[model samples]
Target: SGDLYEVERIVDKRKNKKGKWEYLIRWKGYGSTEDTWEPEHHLLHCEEFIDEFNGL
Candidate 1:
């Protein structure tokens, strides 16, 4: 589950029912059907990647 994947796009963002920030991730090498919503903390090491996603 720790595969390195390029972020294709940030589909959306919102707080879950528990109030945790989450981001919809479209992984590069994977189809849109494979996209997922991941917790923000899980992607903290990829700040530049997130910035680039926002720039798109």
Candidate 2:
């Protein structure tokens, strides 16, 4: 487990026409409107969350 960004969780994924695969990450204790899109690689620290988002 890591605490680099204190990610609350991801609501949905994004695949923009000009960007890498990213997910919308909700900041811990922050407003939902404040969440942002983060690339998978950049958020590799939170693997479990990613896995849940992409449930098998």
Candidate 3:
């Protein structure tokens, strides 16, 4: 399995230079310093995770 990492949660969202959205990902078992900005397309499997964060 290559590049399969569990998303602990989505903290924030932002539009980059071209206005495409990216998400701040809190990866499982990682500290805040390890959190990373992931492209939306890369998180296609995390529909509920994204929705839950955005829902609030």
Candidate 4:
């Protein structure tokens, strides 16, 4: 379970990189931050979540 995930992308409706925004997903144990993310980091580590984000 030594996988790594990174915050690949981010989007904000307020046109502010520092403002609240959506992001591309990335999960641990699955590999690759380009395919998993969440508004909250605590709930981003799931296969289903990865699939959902990848589909988007």
Q: After superposition, how far is residue 10 of candidate 4 from its true place, in Å?
A: 7.8
Clashes of each: 0, 0, 0, 4
Question: Compared with the true structure, what per-residue lDDT tens digits does model 4 show for residues 1-56?
Answer: 64545443332112135564344553333445345434443334444544455567
Best by lDDT: 3
For model 1, how does the per-residue alpha-carbon lDDT over 1-56 read when each residue is reduced to its tens digit?
Answer: 68666787788778988998788998888888998989887774777666776787
List the candidates' TM-scores in order. Answer: 0.64, 0.71, 0.83, 0.23
Error of 1 at 46 (Å): 3.3
Model 2 has an lDDT value of 0.82
**How high is the CA lDDT of each candidate model?**
0.80, 0.82, 0.89, 0.41
- Rank candidates, TM-score, best first: 3, 2, 1, 4
Clashing pairs in 1: none
Query: Which of the numbered candidates is closest to the native, going by highest TM-score?
Result: 3
**What TM-score would candidate 3 get against the native?**
0.83
| Candidate 3 backbone collisions, by pair | none
Cα displacement (angstroms), candidate 1, residue 42, comes to 0.7
TM-score of 1: 0.64
Candidate 2 lDDT over residue span 1-56, tens digit each:
74566888888998867777789999999998898887777775688988888895
Per-candidate RMSD vs. true structure?
Answer: 2.7, 4.3, 1.9, 10.7
